[PDB]
Every structure is written in C-alpha cells, then in structure tokens.
Coordinates of N, CA and C (backbone and C1' of nucleotides) in Angstrom, one line a residue:
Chain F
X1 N 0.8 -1.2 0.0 CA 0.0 0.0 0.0 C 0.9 1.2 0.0
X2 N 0.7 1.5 -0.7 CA 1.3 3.2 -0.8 C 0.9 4.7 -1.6
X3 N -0.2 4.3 -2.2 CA -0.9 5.3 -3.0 C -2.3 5.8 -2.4
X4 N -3.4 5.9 -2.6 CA -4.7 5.7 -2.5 C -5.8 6.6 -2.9
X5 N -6.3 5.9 -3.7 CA -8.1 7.0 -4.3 C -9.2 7.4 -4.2
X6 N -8.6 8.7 -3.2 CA -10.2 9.5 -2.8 C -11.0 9.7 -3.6
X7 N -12.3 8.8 -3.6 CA -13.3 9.5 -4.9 C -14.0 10.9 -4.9
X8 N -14.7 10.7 -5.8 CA -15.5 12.0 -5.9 C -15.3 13.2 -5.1
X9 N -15.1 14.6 -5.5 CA -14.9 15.9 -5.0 C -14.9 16.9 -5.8
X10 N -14.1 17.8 -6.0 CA -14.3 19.4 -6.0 C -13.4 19.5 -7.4
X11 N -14.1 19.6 -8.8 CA -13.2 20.0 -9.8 C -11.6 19.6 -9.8
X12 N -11.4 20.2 -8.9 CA -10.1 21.1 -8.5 C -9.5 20.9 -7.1
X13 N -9.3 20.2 -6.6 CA -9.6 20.1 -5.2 C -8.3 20.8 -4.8
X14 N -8.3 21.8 -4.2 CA -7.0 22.8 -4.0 C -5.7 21.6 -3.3
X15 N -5.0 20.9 -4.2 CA -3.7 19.8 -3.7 C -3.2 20.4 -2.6
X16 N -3.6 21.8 -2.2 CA -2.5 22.5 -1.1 C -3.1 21.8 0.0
X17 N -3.9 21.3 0.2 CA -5.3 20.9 1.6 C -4.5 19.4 1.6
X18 N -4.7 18.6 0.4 CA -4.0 17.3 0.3 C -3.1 17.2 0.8
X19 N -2.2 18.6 0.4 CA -0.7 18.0 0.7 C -0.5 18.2 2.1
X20 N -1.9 18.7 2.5 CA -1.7 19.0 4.2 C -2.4 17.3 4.4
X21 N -3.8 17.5 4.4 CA -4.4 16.2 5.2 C -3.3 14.8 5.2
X22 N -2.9 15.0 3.4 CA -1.8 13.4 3.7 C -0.8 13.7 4.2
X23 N -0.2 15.2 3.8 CA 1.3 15.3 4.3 C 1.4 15.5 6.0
X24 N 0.4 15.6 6.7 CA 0.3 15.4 7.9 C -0.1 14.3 8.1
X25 N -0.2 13.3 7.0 CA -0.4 12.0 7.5 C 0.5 11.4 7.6
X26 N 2.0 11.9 6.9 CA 2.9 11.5 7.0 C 3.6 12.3 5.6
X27 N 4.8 11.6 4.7 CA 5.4 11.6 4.0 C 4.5 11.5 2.3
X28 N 3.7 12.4 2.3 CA 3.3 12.3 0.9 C 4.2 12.4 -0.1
X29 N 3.8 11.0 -1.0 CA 4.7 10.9 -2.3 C 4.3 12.2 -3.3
X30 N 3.3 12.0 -3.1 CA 2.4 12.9 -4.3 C 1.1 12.6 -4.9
X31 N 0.0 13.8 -5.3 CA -0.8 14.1 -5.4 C -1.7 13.8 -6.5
X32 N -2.8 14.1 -6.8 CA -3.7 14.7 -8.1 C -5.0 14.2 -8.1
X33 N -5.6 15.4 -9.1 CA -6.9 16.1 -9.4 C -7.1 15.6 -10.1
X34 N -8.4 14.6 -10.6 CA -8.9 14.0 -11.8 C -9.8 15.6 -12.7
X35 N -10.8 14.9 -13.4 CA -11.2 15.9 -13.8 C -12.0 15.3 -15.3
X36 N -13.4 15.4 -14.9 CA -13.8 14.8 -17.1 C -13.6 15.7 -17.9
X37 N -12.0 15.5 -18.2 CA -11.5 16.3 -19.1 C -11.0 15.2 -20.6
X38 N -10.7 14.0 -20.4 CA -10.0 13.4 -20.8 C -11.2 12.2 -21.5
X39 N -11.8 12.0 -20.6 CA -13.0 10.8 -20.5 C -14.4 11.4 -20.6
X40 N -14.9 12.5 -20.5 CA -16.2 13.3 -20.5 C -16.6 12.3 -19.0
X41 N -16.6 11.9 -17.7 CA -17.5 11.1 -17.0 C -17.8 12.2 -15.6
X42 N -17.5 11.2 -14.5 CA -17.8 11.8 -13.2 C -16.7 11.8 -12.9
X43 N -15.9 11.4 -12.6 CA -14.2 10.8 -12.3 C -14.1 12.0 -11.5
X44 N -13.4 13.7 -11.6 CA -13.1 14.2 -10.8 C -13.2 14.0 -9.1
X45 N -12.2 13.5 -8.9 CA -12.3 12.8 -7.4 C -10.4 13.3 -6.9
X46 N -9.8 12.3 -6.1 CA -8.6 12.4 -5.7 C -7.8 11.6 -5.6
X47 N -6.4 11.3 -6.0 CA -5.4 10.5 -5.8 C -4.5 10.7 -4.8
X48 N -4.1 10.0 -3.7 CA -2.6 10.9 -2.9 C -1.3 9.6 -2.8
X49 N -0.4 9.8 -3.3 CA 0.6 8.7 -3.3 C 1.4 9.3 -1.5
X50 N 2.1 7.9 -1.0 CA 2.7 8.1 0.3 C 4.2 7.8 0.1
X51 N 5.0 8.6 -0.1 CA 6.7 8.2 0.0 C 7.0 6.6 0.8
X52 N 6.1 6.3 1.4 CA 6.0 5.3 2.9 C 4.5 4.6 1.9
X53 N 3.9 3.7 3.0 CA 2.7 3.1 2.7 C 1.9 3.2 4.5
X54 N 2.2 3.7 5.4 CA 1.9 3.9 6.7 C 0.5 4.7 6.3
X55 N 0.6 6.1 6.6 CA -0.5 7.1 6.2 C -1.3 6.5 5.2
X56 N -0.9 5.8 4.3 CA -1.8 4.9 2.9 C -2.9 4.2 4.2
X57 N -2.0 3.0 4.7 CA -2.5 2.2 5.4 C -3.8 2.5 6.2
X58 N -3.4 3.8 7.3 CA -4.5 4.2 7.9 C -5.8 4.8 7.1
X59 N -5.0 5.3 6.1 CA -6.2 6.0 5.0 C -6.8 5.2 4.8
X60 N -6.9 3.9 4.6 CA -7.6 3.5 3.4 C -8.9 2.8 5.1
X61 N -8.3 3.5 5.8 CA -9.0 3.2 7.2 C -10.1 4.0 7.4
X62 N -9.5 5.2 6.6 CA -10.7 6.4 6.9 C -11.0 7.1 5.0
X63 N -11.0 5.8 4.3 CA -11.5 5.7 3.0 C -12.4 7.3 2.7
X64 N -12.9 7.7 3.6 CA -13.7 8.7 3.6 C -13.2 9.9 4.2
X65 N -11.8 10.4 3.6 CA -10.9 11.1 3.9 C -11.9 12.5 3.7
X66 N -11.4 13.8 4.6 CA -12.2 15.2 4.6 C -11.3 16.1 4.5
X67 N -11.0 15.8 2.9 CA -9.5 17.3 2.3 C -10.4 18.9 2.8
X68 N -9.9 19.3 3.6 CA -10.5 20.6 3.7 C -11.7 20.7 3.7
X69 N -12.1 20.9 2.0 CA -13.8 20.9 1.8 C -14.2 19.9 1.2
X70 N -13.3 19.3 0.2 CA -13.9 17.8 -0.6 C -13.4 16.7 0.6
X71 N -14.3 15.6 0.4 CA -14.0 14.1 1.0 C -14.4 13.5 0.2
X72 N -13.4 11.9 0.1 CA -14.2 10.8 -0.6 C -13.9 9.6 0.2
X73 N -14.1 8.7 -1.2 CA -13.8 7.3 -0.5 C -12.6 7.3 -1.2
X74 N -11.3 7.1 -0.3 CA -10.0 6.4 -0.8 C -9.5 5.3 -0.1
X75 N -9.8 4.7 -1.4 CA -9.9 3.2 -1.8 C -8.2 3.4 -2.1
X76 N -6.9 2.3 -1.5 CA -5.9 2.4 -2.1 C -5.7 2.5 -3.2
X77 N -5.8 3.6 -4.3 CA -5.5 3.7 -5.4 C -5.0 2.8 -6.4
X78 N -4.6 3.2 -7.1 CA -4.0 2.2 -8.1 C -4.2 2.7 -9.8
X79 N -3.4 2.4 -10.4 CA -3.1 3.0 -11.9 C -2.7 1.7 -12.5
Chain A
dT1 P -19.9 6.4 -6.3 O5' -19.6 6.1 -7.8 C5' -18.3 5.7 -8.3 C4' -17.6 6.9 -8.8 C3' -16.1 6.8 -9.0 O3' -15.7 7.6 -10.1 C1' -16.5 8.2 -7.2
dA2 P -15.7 7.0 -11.6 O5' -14.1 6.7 -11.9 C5' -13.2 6.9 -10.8 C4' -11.8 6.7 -11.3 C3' -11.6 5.7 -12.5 O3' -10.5 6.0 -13.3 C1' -10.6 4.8 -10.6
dG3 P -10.7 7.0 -14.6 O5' -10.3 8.4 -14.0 C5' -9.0 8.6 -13.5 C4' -8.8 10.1 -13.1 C3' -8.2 10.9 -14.3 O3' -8.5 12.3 -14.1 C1' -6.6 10.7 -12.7
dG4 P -7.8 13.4 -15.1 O5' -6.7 12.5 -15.9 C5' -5.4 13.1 -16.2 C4' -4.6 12.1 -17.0 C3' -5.4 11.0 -17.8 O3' -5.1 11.0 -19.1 C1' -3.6 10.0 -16.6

DNA sequence: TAGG
C-alpha cells in the first residue's frame, strides 16, 4: 500500500489541503486532481501517493478522507 | 467516485 483513491470531490480540489491532510499523515509521495476532461464522465475525485505506505494504510481506514472541503472514499488507489 |  502506498498510493490511494479519494473518490469523488471538487473540480479542482485545492492539492495544497492534500498536501496537508496526507502530508500530515505523514510523507506524501504525491498528489492529483482528476477531472472529465480526458473521458467526458464523473471521475473528478482524488489520488494521494505516500513516499512510505503507513498514512496509505490508515487512510484506506478512513477511505472517507475530509481534504479541507472535498472528501471521498480512498480506496488504495491504483493506476 | 478509478486521474492520466
């Protein structure tokens, strides 16, 4: 475990909140903002990768992570 | 809710 996929949220979901909620969850690998830009669907949701897989771990505990204003379900991600 |  070391990534994981917040669904559904906010366009845009300001990554600065992410990089707090996970980077206070520990060592965020890194980020991103979906968006139906690519696929025309619902998709815009959230991804947060973990330098570590710890903060992954508990995340996928609180699947229903609360970025500032957007939350979703992150489900360990995956690409 | 699965980017990209």
């Amino acid at each position: 475990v070391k990534k994981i996929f917040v669904g559904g949220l906010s366009p845009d979901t300001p990554e600065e909140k992410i990089r707090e909620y996970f980077g206070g969850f520990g060592e965020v690998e890194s980020i991103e903002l979906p968006m139906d830009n690519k696929t025309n669907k619902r998709r815009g949701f959230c991804f947060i990768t973990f330098k570590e897989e710890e903060p992954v771990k508990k995340i996928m505990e609180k699947k229903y992570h609360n970025v500032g204003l957007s939350k979703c379900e992150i489900k360990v991600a995956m690409s």
